[PDB]
Design an enzyme around this catalytic site. Structure first.
Site, PDB file in Angstrom:
ATOM      1  CB  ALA A 117      -0.879  -0.042   1.199  1.00 11.87           C
ATOM      2  CD  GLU A 152       0.374  -7.219  -4.829  1.00 14.26           C
ATOM      3  OE1 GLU A 152       1.729  -6.590  -4.635  1.00 14.26           O
ATOM      4  OE2 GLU A 152      -0.230  -6.758  -5.968  1.00 14.26           O
ATOM      5  CD  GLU A 176      -3.879  -4.348  -4.979  1.00 12.54           C
ATOM      6  OE1 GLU A 176      -3.267  -3.803  -5.539  1.00 12.54           O
ATOM      7  OE2 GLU A 176      -3.569  -5.024  -4.048  1.00 12.54           O
ATOM      8  NE  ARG A 213       2.775   1.144  -9.596  1.00 16.50           N
ATOM      9  CZ  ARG A 213       3.155   0.148  -9.606  1.00 16.50           C
ATOM     10  NH1 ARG A 213       3.101  -0.836  -8.404  1.00 16.50           N
ATOM     11  NH2 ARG A 213       3.648  -0.332 -10.699  1.00 16.50           N
ATOM     12  CD  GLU A 217     -15.332   6.095 -20.391  1.00 11.92           C
ATOM     13  OE1 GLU A 217     -15.165   7.318 -19.811  1.00 11.92           O
ATOM     14  OE2 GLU A 217     -16.452   6.099 -21.156  1.00 11.92           O
ATOM     15  CE1 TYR A 223      -4.028   0.253  -4.479  1.00 10.70           C
ATOM     16  CE2 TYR A 223      -5.402  -0.889  -3.044  1.00 10.70           C
ATOM     17  CZ  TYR A 223      -4.170  -0.124  -3.292  1.00 10.70           C
ATOM     18  OH  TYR A 223      -3.218  -0.307  -2.284  1.00 10.70           O
ATOM     19  CB  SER A 267     -12.853   5.147 -27.796  1.00  9.56           C
ATOM     20  OG  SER A 267     -14.217   5.108 -27.099  1.00  9.56           O
ATOM     21  CE1 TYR A 268     -15.665   3.132 -23.371  1.00  6.38           C
ATOM     22  CE2 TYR A 268     -17.669   2.274 -23.764  1.00  6.38           C
ATOM     23  CZ  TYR A 268     -16.925   3.427 -23.004  1.00  6.38           C
ATOM     24  OH  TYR A 268     -17.528   4.223 -22.218  1.00  6.38           O
TER      25      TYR A 268
HETATM   26  C1  LIG Z   1       6.047  -4.634  -3.972  1.00 12.02           C
HETATM   27  C2  LIG Z   1       5.205  -3.550  -4.606  1.00 12.02           C
HETATM   28  O1  LIG Z   1       4.429  -4.238  -5.578  1.00 12.02           O
HETATM   29  C3  LIG Z   1       3.610  -3.413  -6.372  1.00 12.02           C
HETATM   30  O2  LIG Z   1       4.157  -3.305  -7.796  1.00 12.02           O
HETATM   31  C4  LIG Z   1       4.423  -4.176  -8.619  1.00 12.02           C
HETATM   32  C5  LIG Z   1       5.383  -3.979  -9.754  1.00 12.02           C
HETATM   33  O3  LIG Z   1       4.734  -3.009 -10.506  1.00 12.02           O
HETATM   34  C6  LIG Z   1       3.002  -4.848  -8.802  1.00 12.02           C
HETATM   35  O4  LIG Z   1       3.302  -5.992  -9.825  1.00 12.02           O
HETATM   36  C7  LIG Z   1       2.161  -5.094  -7.497  1.00 12.02           C
HETATM   37  O5  LIG Z   1       0.929  -5.538  -7.935  1.00 12.02           O
HETATM   38  C8  LIG Z   1       2.164  -4.057  -6.825  1.00 12.02           C
HETATM   39  O6  LIG Z   1       1.594  -4.343  -5.596  1.00 12.02           O
END
Ligand SMILES: CCO[C@H]1O[C@H](CO)[C@@H](O)[C@H](O)[C@H]1O
Ligand SMILES: [Ca+2]
Lengths: 702, 706
Positions: free
Chosen positions: B96, B171, B338, B344, B356, B373, B698-699
């Site tokens: 996270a 994970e 996710e 991120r 989208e 997510y 697009s779709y």
């Molecule tokens: C340890 C961090 O993991 C992040 O980054 C990885 C690499 O992009 C992704 O595959 C994972 O899904 C994500 O949680």
């Protein structure tokens, strides 16, 4: 002040298209050339493949006696008839996905073992990879030159033929880049020994620099395998210098042979480096040509630009490359010898609407000329393609001269360039930021690259923590240069080697991205720059070693700097920005006597200071950041604002990129939307809608 | 027989949004939940960070006593008041982008050295990477569970609370992957030695398989360094099998602890693998869960989809991942734990108009549920951000709960889903092509990966030429699966392990991408497949070895194949397609006996044949192609047409992707334009044409009644 191509004594935007006669039905040669001309292009460019024309040993066909597409003479005549200048590229290597990279099959079968590039064990690296300085290779190359060069000479512009430029060979050193493997041919290694004897004079001097225990030059072996000792690093560093001299020796032999035919046209070379649509490795390839560029002011290097798409993911690559080439080649126009048109790879799409925006961004980013590669698709004759039957896809014309989607985009961009070229070519950006290019950080194609699977450089084994490739790729290329471009701050790059102090004084800031090593000349240059009144920004390390990793603390001492290297959390605060993520646990913690602390570890230890030195200013950050958070842009923005540097425009949407190009009379504002979002914004000096992945150009009279 | 979530005996499309209470002003929690609910979402999802709630050793705050955003109890109560079900994810790892991946600072300071994952030299790989089965780690994890699990138990759906699902850890193994290094902790090495003794029983039996000369099990060490001998390959292969048992032991211990609190809700885990907007390494990561998915039918794995952009560069990743999850987990719905919303990474933009299309493409590609997510951006309190103060950008809501551009994209997609879910969840695509998933080719995360530093597997040093990672990435994932999707041929993936023959028999073709090695069970299965009436396409090699690289010629013998391996030009001709570029100089050259020769080398030697064997058909190609030229799509098209497989539609632009999903009531046509071009085209059903214009990236979705 600007460097640009010239035609009829006026600025000329070189617009060339690459059309491979040897891959096109000769019945359609005229149609390809007429369609190229009708886009507003002035020049056509092709290889002249050695394998294609010397069909067996000492049997040459330039007239289509044995295959109609071997009629080079007719193609040259057609270029003249269709009012196109011609760039010719006779090799000996052409690459171009041509079998044996353009070398004749009969040559490769006949050459002795000692003509080939060899691994450290004396094995042939590849059946199509010759040793550049092999006597046998250069003999056959010379016999090829003896036949093709009289034809080129006869068809120069000077003799109202169309030929205006010629490329020597193709991407010299490319095979050592792609493999990470050096040529260990005993003849190469003998030239390396001479280079070392020449450089050090005595074994005692080499031993003092390398910390080696040789009793003579006879003990000396070419470096190989992983770097484990500082003495291996030294030996590899000089092995890299050697290859730069070796490539200069090679291109010099070709050049002098060519000049012997009365070929007086402009000579060219081409720089590769784009990978998966970004170019963070291309500066390493530029660095392989450092000796050529020092010794041949009359050979123009052009860039191979392969963006593949056009987005914020790769927006920074082309500008950073164009700026670095300008730094290394200040007396020639920046041009793209291979300027992406369609795609070499069927599965890697090249959209007309992407490349159109790339062409306009390229103008914003200072390009002065280009050669659409490939304007025309080709069909490989009778299995001569390294890969499939077809050469390139989604081009301007297919192999049959059918117009494709890209054709109308090139016609549109060319119409704009022809309308604006007189003024546009004479425009520059007002850069108040200079960024240092320290070539020794880039000298790693044999030990550390994006293409070298098994890394031979591991700096932790040498007692270092700042890897030169990580520094130059993540902190410099994808960090500082990406950040400045994103923030719409103009920068210039300067080659720090033999760098004129006077040229540095134009700028309000000089940014140096420094590892733990830096040669005495550059440490002295940066000392003098600040002492005389310059504002220096230096991170992530005050260097304490020279290029051979021997003690060199000139900059540290001249600046009154003391530090300890200490482990802390990756996050620091800098200029009141909290939670700045840094690359390393280890940071420089600075004594702050006579200094202002401006950055702090989680424990509040001082990892950055500002200081007055003589008439100038020093900002030292003991930590490494690139651009991987909004705090990184906030920090770059604060640093630029330390010396009151302002963007040229207030633009209401920060994610619009702009470039202001002006001269005395004319201003061009280039607005670039690198995002999949229709954006609406307004601008003023310090209300317009732009489609996704699109552009707008505004003219202002001054 | 589609798998989908069910609510109150009806198909239910699970629409969740991720909202981190610990990263949002608690005065705004209700506004985030209300705005999430107004998109038509039925569920909200959050981590419960151990570091956030156990603020010092044995000092627990779930009530906002020491910081308002520590008030988990209030957040749970607000979820129930705003009619959202809740997915909780208490770790112990959450990742996270939270400091120390969610583990308390006080814990990582306190743990002794033998709690940590260690390299072969015995050095700590990373100061926030524990050894999963460390006694010390599990003792503290259990004390954290003792405090968080009673709260989770009390607030479960069966007690009229909102909690419907819980994720175990996060994970598993994502650090043995990203760190670029294997865990040599002595707890691990001793479990491995036990595993080996149990597997082989005697040193003589191990020596016969490995071709080693050990005097006793005490002489056997955990494999390290590069593979130089076939015995090194055997040791590493078993080391991979062991890690799959190890991850199953870890999840089993967490699950048994959880169940003791009276927690009966659905348990989940989440699959990593995307990086830089491609997922070609995800199948390797999902293969690390092979022993969990066999032992725990009650744990549902979901995908962590991170496309970053939506173009032909990555169009095939999501479908190939969804199909591979279905193969490994055929008794649960394919869902995204996710499902990218925003980014991120500030410097890696996520455009609403990309995502989208990704959402609609996911529906076309068979997704049955997802958790956006991040739905809500967060601000890290108290310096807890791993990488900076702001958690995610370009989300549906900013941290303040303002709507951003993505909010209207998610509302539009959710509205289509809620209108159509009753039929859409019950729709299938008609796949006449089955592609085999041979898990052992994927068992390389210790020796060969895009992320691993030291490449430890060089098959040429073992007398081999077909690298399993090269095969599974370039010939299968980026090659065959990419090619079929591009050509708009539906495929299913089947796990070949303990595979029932009667599942394979519904397909017109089975496609097997084979290395030189394949276990006796799979060689026998494919033999029976063809003898009984199956149509098999097999390339680039008839295998002659087993998983330990010992002789196994079952399939070669059953198919009456003779071949020799010979060097030639990369280019071959196949089915009258000239200059097909192949990956290897070495090719299998087949005897022409009782066969039709259909592929030739530059010396016109036979490198592919077709034959009839019992009631079945065999096509073998002794050469490797993926999708790196137009000749490759022409070749895939020819192979598919050998059994008269037809696309569902005639479409006038070959670069438009479509999926037809249908049940008895309803047909959905999904058109996907993964290209930066406004396309105008016409189409019709294979058994008057409609014209369509589609924007870049697009779709379009067409619904037909009947
Ligand atoms: C340890 C961090 O993991 C992040 O980054 C990885 C690499 O992009 C992704 O595959 C994972 O899904 C994500 O949680
Ligand atoms: Ca001092």
């Amino acid at each position: 002040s600007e460097k640009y191509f010239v035609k009829n004594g006026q600025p000329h935007f070189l617009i060339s298209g690459e059309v491979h006669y040897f891959r096109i039905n000769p019945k359609l040669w005229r149609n390809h050339l007429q369609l190229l001309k009708q886009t507003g292009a002035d020049t056509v460019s092709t290889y002249i493949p050695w394998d294609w024309h010397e069909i067996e040993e000492d049997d040459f066909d330039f007239e289509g006696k044995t295959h109609p597409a071997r009629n080079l003479i007719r193609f040259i005549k057609l270029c003249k008839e269709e009012n196109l200048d011609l760039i010719v590229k006779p090799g000996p290597y052409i690459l171009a996905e041509y079998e044996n990279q353009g070398l004749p099959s009969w040559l490769l079968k006949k050459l002795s073992k000692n003509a080939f590039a060899l691994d450290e064990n004396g094995n042939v690296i590849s059946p199509d990879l010759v040793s550049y300085l092999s006597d046998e290779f250069l003999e056959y190359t010379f016999k090829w030159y003896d036949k093709v060069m009289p034809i080129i000479s006869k068809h120069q512009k000077e003799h109202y033929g169309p030929i205006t430029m010629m490329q020597l060979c193709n991407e010299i050193g490319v095979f050592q880049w792609l493999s990470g493997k050096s040529d260990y041919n005993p003849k190469v290694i003998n030239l390396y020994k001479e280079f070392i004897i020449q450089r050090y004079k005595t074994i005692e001097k080499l031993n003092s620099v390398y910390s080696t225990n040789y009793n003579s030059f006879d003990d000396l072996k070419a470096p190989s395998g992983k770097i484990k000792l500082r003495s291996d690093y030294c030996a590899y560093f000089d092995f890299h210098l050697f290859f730069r001299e070796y490539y200069n020796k090679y291109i010099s032999i070709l050049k002098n042979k060519i000049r012997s035919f009365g070929i007086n046209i402009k000579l060219t070379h081409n720089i590769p480096g784009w990978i998966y649509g970004n170019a963070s490795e291309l500066p390493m390839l530029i660095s392989t040509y450092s000796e050529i560029m020092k010794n041949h002011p009359d050979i123009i290097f052009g860039l191979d630009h392969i963006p593949e798409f056009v987005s914020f993911r790769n927006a920074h690559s082309d500008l950073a490359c164009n700026k670095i080439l300008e730094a290394m080649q200040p007396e020639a126009p920046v041009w793209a010898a291979e300027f992406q048109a369609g795609t070499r790879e069927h599965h890697v799409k090249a959209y007309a609407k992407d490349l159109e925006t790339f062409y306009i961004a390229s103008l914003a980013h200072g390009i002065k000329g280009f050669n659409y590669y490939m304007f025309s698709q080709g069909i490989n004759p009778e299995g001569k393609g390294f890969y499939g039957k077809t050469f390139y896809f989604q081009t301007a014309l297919d192999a049959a001269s059918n117009k494709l989607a890209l054709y109308d985009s090139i016609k549109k961009v060319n119409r704009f360039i022809r309308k604006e070229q007189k003024d546009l070519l004479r425009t520059n950006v007002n850069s108040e930021i200079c960024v240092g290019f320290y070539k020794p950080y880039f000298f790693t194609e044999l030990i550390s690259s994006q293409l070298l699977k098994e890394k031979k450089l591991n700096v932790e084994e040498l007692g270092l923590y700042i890897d030169p490739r990580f520094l130059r790729e993540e902190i410099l290329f994808n960090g500082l240069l990406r950040g400045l471009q994103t923030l719409n701050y103009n920068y210039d790059v300067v080659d720090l080697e033999n760098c004129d102090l006077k040229s540095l004084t134009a700028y309000k800031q000089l940014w140096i991205t420094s590892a733990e090593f830096m040669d005495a000349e550059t440490q002295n240059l940066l000392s003098e720059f600040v002492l005389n009144g310059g504002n220096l920004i230096l991170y992530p390390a005050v260097p304490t070693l020279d290029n051979y990793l021997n003690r060199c603390e000139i900059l540290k001492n001249n600046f009154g700097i003391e530090f300890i290297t200490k482990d802390s959390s990756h996050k620091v605060s800098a200029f009141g920005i909290e939670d700045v993520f840094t690359a390393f646990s280890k940071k420089q913690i600075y004594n702050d006597t006579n200094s202002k602390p401006i950055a702090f570890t989680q424990e509040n230890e001082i990892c950055g200071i500002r200081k007055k030195i003589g008439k100038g200013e020093l900002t030292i950050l003991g930590f490494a950041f690139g651009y991987t958070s909004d705090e990184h842009l906030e920090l770059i923005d604060k640093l630029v604002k330390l010396n009151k540097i302002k963007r040229e425009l207030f633009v209401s949407d920060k994610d619009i990129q702009f470039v202001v190009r002006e001269n005395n009379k004319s201003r061009y504002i280039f607005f670039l939307n690198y995002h999949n979002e229709r954006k609406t914004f307004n601008y003023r000096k310090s209300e317009i809608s732009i489609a996704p992945f699109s552009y707008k150009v505004i003219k202002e009279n001054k």
